[PDB]
Design a protein around this ligand. Sequence first.
Ligand code: FE2
Ligand code: FE2
Ligand code: FE2
Ligand code: FE2
Ligand code: FE2
Ligand code: FE2
Ligand code: FE2
Ligand code: FE2
Lengths: 264, 264, 264, 264
Amino acid sequence: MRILFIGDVVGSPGRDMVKEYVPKLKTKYKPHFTIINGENAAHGKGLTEKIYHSLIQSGADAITMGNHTWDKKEIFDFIDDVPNLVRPANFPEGTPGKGITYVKANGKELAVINLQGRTFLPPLDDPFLKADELIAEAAKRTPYIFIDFHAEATSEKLALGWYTDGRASAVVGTHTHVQTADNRILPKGTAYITDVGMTGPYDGILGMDRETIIKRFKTNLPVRFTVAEGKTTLSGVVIDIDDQTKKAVKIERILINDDHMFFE
Amino acid sequence: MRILFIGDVVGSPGRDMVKEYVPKLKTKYKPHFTIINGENAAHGKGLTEKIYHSLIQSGADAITMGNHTWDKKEIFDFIDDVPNLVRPANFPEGTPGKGITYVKANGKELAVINLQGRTFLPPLDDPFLKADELIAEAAKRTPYIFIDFHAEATSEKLALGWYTDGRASAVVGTHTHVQTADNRILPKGTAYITDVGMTGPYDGILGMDRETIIKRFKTNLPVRFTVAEGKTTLSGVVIDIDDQTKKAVKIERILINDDHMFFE
Amino acid sequence: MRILFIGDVVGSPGRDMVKEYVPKLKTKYKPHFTIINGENAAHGKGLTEKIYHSLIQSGADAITMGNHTWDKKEIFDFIDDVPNLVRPANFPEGTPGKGITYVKANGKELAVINLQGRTFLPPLDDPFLKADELIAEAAKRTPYIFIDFHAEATSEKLALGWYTDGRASAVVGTHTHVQTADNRILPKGTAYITDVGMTGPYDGILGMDRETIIKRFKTNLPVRFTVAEGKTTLSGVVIDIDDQTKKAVKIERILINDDHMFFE
Amino acid sequence: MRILFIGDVVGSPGRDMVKEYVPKLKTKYKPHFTIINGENAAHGKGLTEKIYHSLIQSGADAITMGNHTWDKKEIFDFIDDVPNLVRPANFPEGTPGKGITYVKANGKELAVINLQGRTFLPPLDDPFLKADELIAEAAKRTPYIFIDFHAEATSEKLALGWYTDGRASAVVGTHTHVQTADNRILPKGTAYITDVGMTGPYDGILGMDRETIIKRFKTNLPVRFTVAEGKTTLSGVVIDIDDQTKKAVKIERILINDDHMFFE
Ligand SMILES: [Fe+2]
Ligand SMILES: [Fe+2]
Ligand SMILES: [Fe+2]
Ligand SMILES: [Fe+2]
Ligand SMILES: [Fe+2]
Ligand SMILES: [Fe+2]
Ligand SMILES: [Fe+2]
Ligand SMILES: [Fe+2]
């Protein structure tokens, strides 16, 4: 089973990048499952109904989210009405939407779990205990189990990866908008990467207009929230899971930008 | 000129990794300057006099530091006796030691500057204005200017890189202990990477014993400070600067571990 | 019934203050229950078995704790074996000790609950849901329910007080080591104060040596952990609950120091 | 010399309390100087020109601010144009407005300084060194020196009070919206209180609608920014400085609400 995962989509530039390159990536890699983190898709934060459908149309089988899930209130109008949208599972009981979805595509089934870290972030429920709960639930239905862990601290991300080794098929990090080079398969067969990175402006600061972000750092004064425009980048991973052993056997990084040309 | 930079050395396993591989890297790449971040070298945090000299002996020309600079109070006894130890320049005026040093090779001086980020970290002086001050001062003396920015937030690291583009020759990030894949040359010629990564245990959590760190996440109870033992890793970069144009022309990542074997 | 509560006891000076004044307060006010927060009692952090017994001897019927509960490791060997010691209830399931205790004394019964806030503190379990859970447990047995909420943020403390109004008999804040002047009875009858304050050195910074604390603020460098010498202070509240209506009818602040002499 | 200081004015209910009670307070105490913190005055955050004038109209001689100074953008067009308005002095050089002002009354001049803490807040310039700089400036012009320190952490507030003892005439804290009971004259003659409290709704959470704040704590979801309806409160202090010794000799707390009726 092959999974293609695309990191945090940031605003229209990210959406444009998805529209162009996900179909090409799908042609190139022929993944059984395609997952996209859309937490910044609506002008940099949150999601609209139109955007959810356009991301699906671009080739996503499921969409994962993060700390900005709720930033556009319109999400409350459609979240329980669409089939393949996941938000962090460790938001308190009673939160709208779901933290796990079972993606049925190309004759297979992948459990897709979204979790959010707590270091440097709001005090949600414990994602470690939540991971245990959802992994055991998922395992009753499918041995293919994928986690998008949206977190800030490298320590917390690596801890979750090691903690779930051999129990989740793959654990990929998102949130920091910078792809890491530590993609590897852990000793018990779980594919792991600390952060997949972002899809959106390449020459902003994490997708945001450079001048505003630098001004905030230098002045401590508030600035307008402004998404960058210009060159674009896409960040993703392709993960292969052995259908017999259920272990991950490969995790390859994808980067497409002026410094990493796309081939084929 | 060519610069070899080695990421956060963690404890004795990190020191062992440096002792073996830094000489081999110098043979392979023949850098004019070698810089090592030693902030975790003394059993996970801080530095001793013997360890400083041992790192120099392994091939370092200068040692940069970070938030753990002062964790072993012995440092106050030797900081005035060692010649090329740099700590974050933005600690308050009156802090022992220095934030910039100059090393010379093949007729050219390299200014080596250490700065520390403030997001998710203590409120030091502003590293942006400090960078301006030190860049201006160094530029009176040499156009070759290297910054090791020890910081947590990707936003802050990228902001500094872009902010100093064309003024610093290279800006590399440290602190998170995970190497990033975003090594690039910015438009005005500054080499940049968000985090070089760490040198030390490969199968801990950021160098720390896995069990202890996972227990702390799950229990919220204190745990003993325990550096991991086992497989090791080294993370670094090799940066080339064109000495005619003063622009960086290449930044290559170095990873040495069981997933990235070293070849002479 | 009447409750006497004494705020965070800090080190030996705090213990000395308790030894001298708690017996005098008990004579003056004749409380049915006396509760003391002991979280800093052992040289500024944690609790030893010897000090637990000493606080009981001085007149405490129950001892509540806080973020420093685990700092003196001997607590792991007595916390499960002594009566009426509680730690914050919202540490994860499996944590040693109890977060609720039932005190029978001077003829009546009181449920004493300890909780810890999460703003500016570690990500424990949600204290709001935990408060619901423990109030419902206590309300199977007794209508008299007291909460010591150990928290940093005024917003979080007030929120819990208002949230539990009419359900808890009294909710008092601890942790910031400064008594607040906002003692009041909330509309549904719950006695409330944002912070009771501390018991210990009066001329330190929250109990700590002034020069060490000031140095840390000015230099960002490490300093010795040192409990302050000199004048001492005690902070507390006395709360009256109507035995028929269950409403609190008075909450009076106690301050004993050079600026607030004690009158027998 | 007598100073009347009014704590954070929150929204229209805060403005209503000021309009009614500041004149009554000025009649009762006959202060030479009246200072109001207006940082939340414009619908809960920031300050408009109209409100600036209305606070002066109500009896203020000088207005101090805090972390919300910049929230109503019109402030950028009047801050440099009106008298006796100050913002935290430790915003970086080049920030609009000023951090110190001199108010004249009778034959006396009062230096009014505003500073902002950094613990749990943005990384501004160090307020300790900034205090040193401004006190030294002020002392050449007048021995009457007042500091409004807008900060979250009790340790930081107390540290500044003690640090400046005998150099500032008075140091009062703001920002946490809860009045503290620790008003005192420090050993070298500086009047001190950790937090003066707020002026605005009494039955909100720090002035905000209770149900919205409780919801945010329980759900971790966004809530609308809503100033609370209902009964109101005013918080202040009255400080006396001996005109011969220049020591503070008294600091009295003011509370006006249903639990503290106003006389005269
Ligand atoms: Fe994102
Ligand atoms: Fe995010
Ligand atoms: Fe490090
Ligand atoms: Fe570090
Ligand atoms: Fe305490
Ligand atoms: Fe505490
Ligand atoms: Fe305020
Ligand atoms: Fe404030």
